[PDB]
Amino acid sequence: DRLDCVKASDQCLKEQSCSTKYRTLRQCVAGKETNFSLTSGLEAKDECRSAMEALKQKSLYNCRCKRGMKKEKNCLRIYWSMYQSKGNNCLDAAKACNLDDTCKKYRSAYITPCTTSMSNEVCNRRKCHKALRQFFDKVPAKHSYGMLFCSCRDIACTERRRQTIVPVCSYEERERPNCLSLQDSCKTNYICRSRLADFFTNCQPESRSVSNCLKENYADCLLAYSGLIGTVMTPNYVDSSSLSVAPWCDCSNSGNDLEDCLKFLNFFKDNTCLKNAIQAFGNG
């Protein structure tokens, strides 16, 4: 219903003046069409500035919202042009969830498509992913986070925790791609690009010369992390032992960009801000 950026451009298209102004902006300004390093305008900088200013007082300049489900990429292309670029605690959560009308309702609403009835059948991944996003969108942090970020003392607890997202269906895939390519593939879709950027924003270091974040950053990090679940960039705990997390990717055949791939991956695999935020939720 609410297209967002795309709808707005449609509104712009309706009037001749706005369409022309938009055309000039596209012609004059690189937007994010070229590499930033290149950021060489198609014409000249002065011309781009004028074209940009030309948009003011038109329907155009819009913010791109996620709501463009099918056409996230198209939305993102637009918008970016302007923008840039056993007892245990996991068991207590499962108990609290089922004993609540909203959580029980939304827990099974996602388990339903994420599981398979028979051994060599296969789940619908998109139904499982959508329902996953529904779960963290509709169930308050209280019950939704208890499932995912519960502290553990033994493997029965950790094996339970790692299963929350039904990894077999939602996480694992036959081939493990390269991390930088999947980043690319995530940035095409409107939903993933939106959720990936909040992750990188909310779960970044203190912005002093220390590689740790602050306590006031904690909630925003966990929200940003949890929002990744059900996207192409879905993360899970990599083993049944630690809090180390990662998408379904690795750094094989990174060629000349091996430094950048491992850097991207250690933002998942060795994130101190995330580690601390997860530990804070189920500890003190």
Binding site: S37, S207, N253, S254, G255, N256, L258
Partner: protein, 448 residues
């Protein structure tokens, strides 16, 4: 050309005089005639790469890589920069430095720690701060590229403002090594091309003597970055053997996979980039190019576009050669030895209490199998309930090799007893299953 560092750093104070020299950058060559031409980005940058302001203060000598203050940075300058820093305290400001017409190798970032005070009194500076930057530098030098000057030791704001303090430098631990820092030289250079196969990393000792003499020493690390020193070997060598069935048509039947690996570094284009192509195929006939190999995937398994026939012959030479350009070529050869020689089936209806001559000929799979795969050298069998398991020989498929499946004399079959039989039909070369097993269904009543 490439910088010998990705990042440089110095300090800047309030009210440093226009004319203060700051530091040098250095670009080494990728080819012998290359000569750097240095220029700065347009802006100064602050915390988390905030774009602060056009750079009105620092200039660079385009031939020599000397950065210096064209204009002093007074209290008001530092305020204009601070207020543009998005609310973060202004601790560091940087500039980009490009080496022709920001990432290593072609762009270096120069960082300055800002200190909201005047440059300190000369007599207050300890040897360590007189001698080297606050964190010692480390260097990047490419193997197999021309040697040249990659560092300068003297701290330029200290030599400028404290010219009565004498400072001298030398290296230790470079004996037989490719580094020169000459008596009375403040520069360090390499003397011959480096080579990662001989040494990947150096760690020399830089020694500063101030003045009464006091000495400070720091490590001086150099990382060797890569060259196509190495060529590729086919572990296979001569793949004497390869086999493909005779005359088997397909989009691309996979005859066999040959592989190669490069000694060089995988991250280096030298090792990793290996490509496979078939240089030759003798004989020319029947078709000149019967096969193809996937160059890039490194699967490098040969696939055949065209048909094959009884031992005509086959010999291919495969080249791994990294590139047309300067890459090391190498080959291995393989001989392909040719093996010399659609919609599912409907359930069968049969009528109960059936009588008449023993053998009731029902279906014929053989002219399907040989029809599809183009072979009669295949042995057909049948297994499941009435054939091979429980009720035994009720359905039997033929000591003669023609895939005729028939009902035998189970006293004509009883629909009260068993009213349906499900049987699996097999085809097998000489031991090996060429086909998947089909499922046959025989129902026992009348009509249809």
């Amino acid at each position: 050309l490439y910088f010998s560092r990705d990042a440089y750093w110095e300090k800047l104070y309030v009210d440093q005089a226009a004319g203060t020299p700051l530091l040098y950058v250095h670009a080494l060559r990728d080819a012998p005639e290359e000569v750097p031409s240095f220029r700065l980005g347009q802006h100064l940058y602050g915390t988390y790469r905030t774009r602060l302001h056009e750079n009105n203060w620092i200039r660079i000598q385009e031939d020599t890589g000397l950065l210096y203050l064209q204009r002093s940075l007074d209290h008001s300058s530092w305020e204009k920069l601070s207020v543009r820093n998005r609310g973060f305290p202004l601790l560091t400001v940087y500039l980009k430095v490009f080496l022709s017409p920001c990432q290593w190798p072609g762009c270096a970032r120069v960082y300055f720690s800002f200190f909201n005070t005047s440059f300190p009194a000369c007599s207050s500076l300890k040897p360590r701060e007189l001698c080297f930057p606050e964190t010692r530098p480390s260097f990047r030098i490419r193997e197999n590229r021309p040697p040249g000057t990659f560092h300068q030791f003297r701290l330029l704001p200290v030599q400028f403002l404290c010219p009565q303090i004498s400072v001298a430098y030398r290296l230790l631990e470079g004996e037989g090594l490719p580094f020169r820092s000459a008596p009375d030289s403040l520069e360090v250079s390499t003397r011959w091309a480096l080579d990662r196969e001989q040494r990947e990393k150096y760690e020399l000792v830089a020694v500063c003597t101030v003045h009464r003499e006091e000495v400070v020493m720091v490590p001086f690390p150099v990382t060797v970055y890569d060259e196509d020193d190495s060529a590729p070997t086919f572990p296979a060598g001569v793949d004497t053997a390869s086999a493909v069935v005779e005359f088997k048509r397909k989009e691309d039947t996979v005859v066999a996979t040959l592989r190669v690996f490069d000694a060089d570094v995988v991250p280096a284009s030298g090792e990793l980039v290996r490509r496979y192509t078939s240089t030759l195929l003798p004989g020319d006939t029947w078709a000149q190019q019967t096969f193809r190999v996937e160059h890039w995937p490194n699967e490098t398994s040969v696939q055949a576009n065209g048909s094959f026939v009884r031992a005509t012959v086959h010999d291919y030479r495969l080249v791994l050669n990294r590139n047309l350009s300067i890459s090391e070529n190498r080959t291995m050869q393989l001989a392909v030895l040719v093996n010399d020689s659609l919609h599912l089936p409907s359930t069968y209806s049969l009528s109960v209490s059936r009588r008449a001559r023993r053998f009731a000929q029902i279906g014929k799979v053989c002219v399907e199998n040989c029809q599809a795969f183009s072979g009669i050298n295949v042995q057909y069998k049948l297994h499941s309930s009435g054939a091979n398991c429980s009720t035994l020989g009720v359905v039997t498929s033929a000591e003669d090799t023609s895939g005729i499946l028939f009902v035998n004399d189970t006293k004509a079959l009883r629909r009260p007893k068993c009213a349906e039989l499900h049987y699996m039909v097999v085809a097998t070369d000489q031991q090996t299953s060429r086909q998947a097993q089909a499922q046959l269904l025989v129902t026992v009543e009348g009509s249809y």
